[PDB]
């Protein structure tokens, strides 16, 4: 039942990471297209990356929602590891922020709403992402989001009612103050990253930025940031309710059933939440 490399015709390289190459592939027997992420066992072993490979598989195996890249299958051979993933034809959200410079209110609202919807699902499964950022929000052919990069995600244990996770992972611009100061992250840490992303969609850069990670950390823990002129006022209010140092006071932490109160923020008044993945996204310009 396991697939094999010879079951596919490989095409163009879609991208490369420090430990991986993602290649477009067609499955010969079905003609379906997949993005196949390929890792070298020897390199994974040397760089102490084995647990991250199995974590990526295990976490993605739990997910089945329209706003996440889907893992269809895994396989291996003597030298390589392979993940068969849904192909996000339009690549990274980051590319669009850089090219256009920022998003208008309608586009900011729409994409923010999809990310909220996605996080409601993920956190509902007791999973925290921990590295949410525009590079990890891919876009499918229809321009809906496809969140990726789960090797540094964490499944919180239901059995122990686990709320906090202890591994130090993330990206400096988006890392939460609690991870820096208390050395733990929780679901709310992903809400901090969301606040940074919303700011970035509007302002064109994330709110804590510097040419050195240490300089960024110092600003995060002091909540040292400012809004530009013209920043959509309801978006500013929302960001101010997410970029809160006390992780227990970020909008969405009211209850554990959903993100009802966050969805109810005035920034989202015109949003129809139920069928977001079937709506036509607004054009990015």
Ligand X SMILES: Nc1ncnc2c1ncn2[C@@H]1O[C@H](COP(=O)(O)OP(=O)(O)OP(=O)(O)O)[C@@H](O)[C@H]1O
Which residues are annotated as catalytic?
131
Q: Measure the CA dihedral 143/149/16/97, to 10°.
A: 40
CA distance 114 to 122: 12
19 is in an annotated binding site: yes
Residues 240 and 196 sit within 8 Å (Cβ to Cβ)? no
Expressed in angstroms, the distance from the first to the final Cα of the chain is: 45
Q: Which of 10, 11, 16, 157 binds ligand X (CB under 6 A)?
A: 16
Only one residue has tokens 């939460």, namely 176
Residue 92 contact partner, candidates ligand X, Mg ion, ligand MJF, none, CB within 5 to 8 A by sort of partner: ligand X
Residue 53 contact partner, candidates ligand X, Mg ion, ligand MJF, none, CB within 5 to 8 A by sort of partner: ligand MJF
Residues 102 and 197 sit within 8 Å (Cβ to Cβ)? no
According to the binding rule CB under 6 A, does residue 107 interact with ligand X? no
Q: Which is nearer to ligand MJF, 2 or 99 (CB)?
A: 2
CA distance 163 to 31: 43
Closest contact distance (angstroms) between CB of 84 and Mg ion is 15
CA distance 115 to 147: 8
Residue 236 contact partner, candidates ligand X, ligand MJF, Mg ion, none, CB within 5 to 8 A by sort of partner: none
Q: Which of 8, 67, 82, 87 binds ligand X (CB under 6 A)?
A: 87
Per the annotation, where are the binding residues? 18-20, 37, 86-88, 92, 135, 149
Per the annotation, where are the binding residues for ATP? 18-20, 37, 86-88, 92, 135, 149
């Amino acid at each position: 039942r396991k697939k094999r490399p010879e079951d596919f015709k490989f095409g163009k390289i879609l991208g490369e990471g420090s430990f991986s190459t993602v290649v477009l592939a067609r499955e010969l027997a079905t003609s379906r297209e997949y993005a196949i992420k390929i890792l070298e066992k020897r390199h994974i072993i040397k760089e102490n990356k084995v647990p991250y490979v199995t974590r990526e598989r295990d976490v993605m195996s739990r997910l089945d929602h329209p706003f996440f890249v889907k893992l269809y299958f895994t396989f291996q051979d003597d030298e390589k590891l392979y993940f068969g993933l849904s192909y996000a034809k339009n690549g990274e959200l980051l590319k669009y922020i850089r090219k256009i410079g920022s998003f208008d209110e309608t586009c900011t609202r729409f994409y923010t709403a999809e990310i909220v919807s996605a996080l409601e699902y993920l956190h509902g499964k007791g999973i925290i992402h921990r590295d949410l950022k525009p590079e990890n929000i891919l876009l499918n052919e229809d321009m809906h989001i496809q969140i990726t990069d789960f090797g540094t995600a964490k499944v919180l244990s239901p059995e122990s009612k686990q709320a906090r996770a202890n591994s130090f992972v993330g990206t400096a611009q988006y890392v939460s103050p609690e991870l820096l100061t208390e050395k733990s992250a929780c679901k709310s840490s992903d809400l901090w990253a969301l606040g940074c992303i919303i700011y970035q969609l509007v302002a064109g850069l994330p709110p804590f930025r510097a040419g050195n990670e240490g300089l960024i950390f110092a600003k995060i823990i002091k909540l040292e940031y400012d809004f530009p002129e013209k920043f959509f006022p309801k978006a500013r209010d929302l960001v101010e309710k997410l970029l809160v140092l006390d992780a227990t006071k970020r909008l969405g932490c009211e209850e554990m059933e959903g993100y009802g109160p966050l969805k109810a923020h005035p920034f989202f008044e015109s949003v129809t939440w139920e069928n977001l993945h079937q709506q036509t996204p607004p054009k990015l310009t």
